[PDB]
Amino acid sequence: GTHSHGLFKKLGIPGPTPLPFLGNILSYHKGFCMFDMECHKKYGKVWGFYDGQQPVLAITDPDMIKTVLVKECYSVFTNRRPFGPVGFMKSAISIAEDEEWKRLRSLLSPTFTSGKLKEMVPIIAQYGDVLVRNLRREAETGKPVTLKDVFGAYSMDVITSTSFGVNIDSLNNPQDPFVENTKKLLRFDFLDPFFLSITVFPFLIPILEVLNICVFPREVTNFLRKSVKRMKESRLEDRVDFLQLMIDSQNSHKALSDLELVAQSIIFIFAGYETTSSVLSFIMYELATHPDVQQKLQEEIDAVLPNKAPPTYDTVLQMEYLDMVVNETLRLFPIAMRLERVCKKDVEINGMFIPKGVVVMIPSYALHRDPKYWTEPEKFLPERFSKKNKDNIDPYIYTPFGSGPRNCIGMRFALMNMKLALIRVLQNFSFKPCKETQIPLKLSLGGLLQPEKPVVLKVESRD
Amino acid sequence: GTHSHGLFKKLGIPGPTPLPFLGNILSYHKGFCMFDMECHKKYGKVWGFYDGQQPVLAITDPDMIKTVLVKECYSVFTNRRPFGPVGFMKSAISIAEDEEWKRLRSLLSPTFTSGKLKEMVPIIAQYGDVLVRNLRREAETGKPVTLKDVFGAYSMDVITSTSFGVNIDSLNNPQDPFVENTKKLLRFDFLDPFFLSITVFPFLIPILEVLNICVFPREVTNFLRKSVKRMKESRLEDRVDFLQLMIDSQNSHKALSDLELVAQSIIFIFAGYETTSSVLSFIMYELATHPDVQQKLQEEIDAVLPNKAPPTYDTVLQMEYLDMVVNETLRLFPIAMRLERVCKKDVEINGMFIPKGVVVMIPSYALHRDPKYWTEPEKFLPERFSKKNKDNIDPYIYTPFGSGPRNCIGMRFALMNMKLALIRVLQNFSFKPCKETQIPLKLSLGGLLQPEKPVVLKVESRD
Numbered sequence A, B: 001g002t003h004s005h006g007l008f009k010k011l012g013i014p015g016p017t018p019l020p021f022l023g024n025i026l027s028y029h030k031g032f033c034m035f036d037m038e039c040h041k042k043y044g045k046v047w048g049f050y051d052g053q054q055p056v057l058a059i060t061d062p063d064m065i066k067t068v069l070v071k072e073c074y075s076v077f078t079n080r081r082p083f084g085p086v087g088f089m090k091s092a093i094s095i096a097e098d099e100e101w102k103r104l105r106s107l108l109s110p111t112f113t114s115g116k117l118k119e120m121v122p123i124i125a126q127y128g129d130v131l132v133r134n135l136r137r138e139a140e141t142g143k144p145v146t147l148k149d150v151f152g153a154y155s156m157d158v159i160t161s162t163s164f165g166v167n168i169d170s171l172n173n174p175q176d177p178f179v180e181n182t183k184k185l186l187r188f189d190f191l192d193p194f195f196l197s198i199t200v201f202p203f204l205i206p207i208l209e210v211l212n213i214c215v216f217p218r219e220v221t222n223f224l225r226k227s228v229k230r231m232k233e234s235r236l237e238d239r240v241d242f243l244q245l246m247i248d249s250q251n252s253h254k255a256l257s258d259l260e261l262v263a264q265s266i267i268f269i270f271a272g273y274e275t276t277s278s279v280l281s282f283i284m285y286e287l288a289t290h291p292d293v294q295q296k297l298q299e300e301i302d303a304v305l306p307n308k309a310p311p312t313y314d315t316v317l318q319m320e321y322l323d324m325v326v327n328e329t330l331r332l333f334p335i336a337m338r339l340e341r342v343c344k345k346d347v348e349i350n351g352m353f354i355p356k357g358v359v360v361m362i363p364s365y366a367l368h369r370d371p372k373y374w375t376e377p378e379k380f381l382p383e384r385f386s387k388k389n390k391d392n393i394d395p396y397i398y399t400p401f402g403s404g405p406r407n408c409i410g411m412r413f414a415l416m417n418m419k420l421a422l423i424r425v426l427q428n429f430s431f432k433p434c435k436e437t438q439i440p441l442k443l444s445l446g447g448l449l450q451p452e453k454p455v456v457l458k459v460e461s462r463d
């Protein structure tokens, strides 16, 4: 339980001294973000710690971050950390490694071009209209609104239609079989008891795989696998969704196997579902607690889109203050918290030796709130991202979507999705705090960047 | 227990149908060689089977064998099969993989040049004199001699002196601490209950490694590790052995770490100890049961080395009939039985697709006795290897030392070692069957190519 706990000592790298077997995981009692902030503050630009026996090297120099995420991505820093028993989802692009990831990224990148996105915009926009209709119910009864619920439904609606052409008002069909399955693809809490145990007993992962025990719910993955087979078999006899693009990609490296395709369909839900709804909720919390910013944003929207004109791909990209609001919220709440890459081979990068097998970690949350780069980092200040000020932002300090060849493949889609939701909602409503609104917002101490209590807000119709 | 058991069926490759969990391991009840001979006979040039869940593709075409062992060695077929919990012996050259093997092979190849070998010959020759002295005791009492005992002692003597400068008459110091340790580095029986269980439960290997349970005896490896540290620390203050060559290589890729060095010292014992003594025993069994061949060999020795002249590097390499006898015995008894390489990536080689992760196996024992290539393959016929006949021998059918960049690194040393022993012994003695000699020889049904009963022979002094 100590074998590798001498590594950073031998390399002269500072960090919290690890306990046998556990390493440093007891320092996670306040979650990832507080641990990373405290280590940054007390150890400086680089430090190392141990998740069980696994050494993790944290780096904060932007030039070093570029070398890892960009310059040496294919040669040395290709893969993320393996995390638990995964079964056939081994073929999902975010979990695949080395040449197999490189292949999958090539097969799937044409699916995320601006041209495919623009062709999807009318689809996503339809569910913004559904969102507004549902919000209007509660704006009329005066009941406070739980944001994760309404933005969760929106997120689900956009996924099911843009992924499979499945058109559902999920907020009002919460027991449609397709919705009750996809709702279960939530983000993993890596500080929960199962994942803590796997970190201390990583040698048990092969035992779980041989028993077909999978961190992705078996019932959900099998429902989706058989649903997809049915859509594929259909369709053929008699759409601009991700499934159709992937189906088309199967007829011209060696094509995308049928199982590989279902794995991507599932991982796209997992990657986009709770991420989008969380960020939307943080944004509306910031707008509700900064009425001046909400008004300025509604003024911009009304100017670009007079008389509640429906948003379009081009009109969205025109809105600079909208972009500034989205960007500043993601500075405060980079829901990934950390970026990680395994070091595949002994390397020396910009001054320091990094041994094979170390996980190199970029603490996005901590860098996003680092006073060296950000004046008053705890304040919500969209003007940081104005054309005036934004040139002073280092792209390797601000990394809410990662960076380089393995960054977020759905970044453009997620930005466009969230902005289209925000536009439609703000055209129709203003959001204000309740007495049940938690002000200021407290973050959870678990493994997910989420509010301590669900955000709840009053919705008032601008009509 | 069936996941991968459909692979050869899907590829249209024949082979014995596997049972759940076990695969084909129940067919090992007569050992590796009989299983490989029977499959070759009933399935043809290629077949597949499963060691538990691991698929193994057997190949017999010499052009395909060259492609695997030679042409695509670095790109695709670099590594042997992982086999059990190995601990720090992970750094031993025969167990290392990919770039780390390539590095170790580069660091260690200068240690096995003809020039280093010739410099070692006086050392090895000294223990041939010790062998003869010990044999003479039993040639005088008339007691039959157990070959593995006398050739085991010889093998040990040559190792301890050529590896560490440790000069011991091990047959008469059988409880010297250094001898009692090195005697334990015997070949693994992969059909024994532990290794059968590991084959059926390969998922338990990580559990064993985390508990520091190692297939190499811990007490032996630690005795040798501390012995080596003592020799290294000594020596320095105040030799042409492998240790000295490796020590010298540490002062000019990034040099050979201290632990890496001890790992090679241990693996060289493991690789050469029981291998050399087994082959010597097979050779003397063939000479004793073919007196005409033994006489012709003694006649050649007496002609090259009149009046029991001591053998030299150059005189050994002059003896053609000696070479033919050694080579034909190794045709009958290729103690490795099989050569193996893991397929690192999907490839198509000479006509057939081979998927990633399959073990490609070359059944040396079966090819060595294949009637297509060998007239009367069960007969001991040294004239096969005469300059007359030897051009008709395919170097990828006859592979007692493997082939290509990852062949036996100690091949020249082992040949020179065995020949020097045979020369000295045959200069002084003739070996004849006893009534306790098993004729014809029966092979064991376990996992090692060894006689069923120990070979025992009468030794008669030519004086």
Ligand code: HEM
Pocket: A069, A093, A094, A095, A105, A267, A268, A271, A272, A273, A275, A276, A279, A335, A336, A339, A340, A399, A400, A401, A402, A403, A404, A405, A406, A407, A408, A409, A410, A411, A413, A414, A415
């Ligand atoms: C606001 C919403 C989202 C945020 C903040 C976000 C953030 C991130 C981050 C930080 C990464 C890691 C990048 C790196 O390691 O350098 C990532 C990866 C990824 N995201 Fe997103 N993401 C979001 C939405 C989405 C959506 C909607 C999709 C799919 C439609 C998606 C698909 C992926 C995939 C596949 C990866 C792994 C890429 C690869 O391994 O090649 N994400 N995301």
Ligand code: HEM
Pocket: B069, B093, B094, B095, B105, B267, B268, B271, B272, B273, B275, B276, B279, B335, B336, B339, B340, B399, B400, B401, B402, B403, B404, B405, B406, B407, B408, B409, B410, B411, B413, B414, B415
């Ligand atoms: C008659 C005695 C010996 C026989 C029949 C023999 C046979 C073999 C065979 C068939 C291989 C596998 C080659 C392949 O996979 O293509 C091998 C590998 C090897 N042998 Fe030998 N061997 C003998 C003696 C020795 C000795 C004396 C040493 C060391 C001094 C040695 C060191 C090695 C090593 C290190 C490997 C692995 C090479 C690598 O992985 O790079 N062997 N041997």
